[PDB]
Design a protein around this ligand. Structure first.
Ligand SMILES: [Zn+2]
Length: 236
């Protein structure tokens, strides 16, 4: 049929737009995954920097607190030494000896902890510095790539805009019963669903038609579907 040939030519041309649009959407999604992968590499480094900063804040305060308590014990030991220089009774002399011994031993313990904290802060500062460097290098190595990816997406979006408007100008003059079938097939298969007979097989699924079924397709007087994949078959 003349009219069937026109309906086919029209859906065939819509089908080429739909294939491109499916391709574009897949490449967009792939570019967006590549961006999220880059963002996630940076976000991981920022998290490490944040955890290190909070840890440095705790060290700062434990260091300040330790120095202050060491100071306080040191002043108290000095007070005890002045007291002892003036005592006359052996029991008081001895109590001050014992107290100073005990106080000094606690101070010694605090000083060794303070040394430990200061060393942790020194090594953690080196680690923070290295993580900031790595954050800056990653951002630097990646900013040109991210902007090039985003521009590709832009150009995909704008090309997709054009293929949509073209699709809409063809849908107007296209047979609506055939389109309604086409569109459900396409949503199901995501590739060409109006397909020709090649080498006496369905070119969509590659399963051979019975000769009777080929006869039906050639008459071109009604929509004929592949008996195995359900795609629309046509001749030429
Ligand atoms: Zn088939």
């Amino acid at each position: 049929s003349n009219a069937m040939h026109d309906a086919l030519q029209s859906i065939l041309a819509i089908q080429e737009l739909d294939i491109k649009m499916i391709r574009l959407m897949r490449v967009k999604k792939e570019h967006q995954n590549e961006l999220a992968k880059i963002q996630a590499l940076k976000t991981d480094i920022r998290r490490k920097v944040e955890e290190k900063e909070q840890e440095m804040e705790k060290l700062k305060d434990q260091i300040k607190g330790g120095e202050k308590r060491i100071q306080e014990i040191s002043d108290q030991i000095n007070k005890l030494e002045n007291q002892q220089a003036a005592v006359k009774k052996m029991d008081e002399f001895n109590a001050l000896t014992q107290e100073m011994t005990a106080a000094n031993k606690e101070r010694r313990t605090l000083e060794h902890q303070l040394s430990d904290l200061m060393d942790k802060q020194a090594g953690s500062e080196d680690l923070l510095i290295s993580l900031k460097e790595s954050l800056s290098s990653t951002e630097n190595s990646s900013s040109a790539i991210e902007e090039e990816i985003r521009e590709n997406i832009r150009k995909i979006n704008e090309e997709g805009r054009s293929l949509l408007s073209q699709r809409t100008q063809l849908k107007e003059t296209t047979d609506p019963e055939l389109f309604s079938v086409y569109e459900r097939l396409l949503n199901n298969k995501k590739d060409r669903v109006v397909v020709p007979i090649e080498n006496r097989v369905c070119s969509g699924c590659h399963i051979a038609l019975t000769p009777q079924h080929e006869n039906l397709v050639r008459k071109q007087d009604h929509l004929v579907f592949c008996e195995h994949c359900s795609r629309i078959l046509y001749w030429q």
